[PDB]
Amino acid sequence: SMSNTISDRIVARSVIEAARFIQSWEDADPDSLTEDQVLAAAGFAARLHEGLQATVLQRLVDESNHEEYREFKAWEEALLNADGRVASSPFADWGWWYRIANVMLATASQNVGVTWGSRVHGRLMAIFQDKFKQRYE
């Protein structure tokens, strides 16, 4: 398939934060971010986090849709590896926040055609470590 419906649904309910992040980080130097670039990244990640947590906890999914249900379960697995039911490692590779950083990279790719890499992604993860350590126990 050529779709990522869960990401589209969450980004589509996060457009103000998404636009603020993309526009703030346009020519950003991840090695020397401004306070406003940090805040725009944290604000978008927090909005994505809120929507994704709601989708997982409330089971906002069609379990009969083979693709959507599997992709939901990957988000659910990431949440369980953050909230202690399976593990308490929210910042592990390919875990909850790593996947949110990936959605933020996707947002830039699909809106303005820019492809960020490790320097941006690692800086996002460091911001999340600084700001969101208390979002899980």
Binding-site residue numbers are 3-4, 66-67, 71
Report how far residue 33's alpha carbon sits from residue 73's, in angstroms, rounded to the nearest whole number.
Answer: 34
Considering Cα of 97, then 103, then 105, then 108, what sign does the dihedral take? negative
When the beta carbons of 5 and 53 are compared against a second copy, the nearer one is 5
Q: Which stretch binds Ca ion (CB under 5 A): 16-24, 66-74, 106-114, 125-133?
A: 66-74
Annotated binding site for Ca(2+): 3-4, 66-67, 71
Q: By Cβ distance, which residue is nearest to Ca ion?
A: 4
Q: Which of 7, 1, 2 is nearest to 104 (CA)?
A: 7
Report how far residue 94's alpha carbon sits from residue 80's, in angstroms, rounded to the nearest whole number.
Answer: 13
**Shortest Cβ distance from residue 13 to a second copy (Å)?**
5
List residues near a second copy by CB under 8 A. 1-5, 7-9, 11-16, 18-20, 22-23, 60, 62, 65, 107, 110-112
- As given in the structure block, the two tokens for residue 118 are 């490790």
The only residue of 4, 53, 102, 111 in contact with Ca ion, by rule CB under 5 A: 4
End-to-end CA distance of the chain: 36
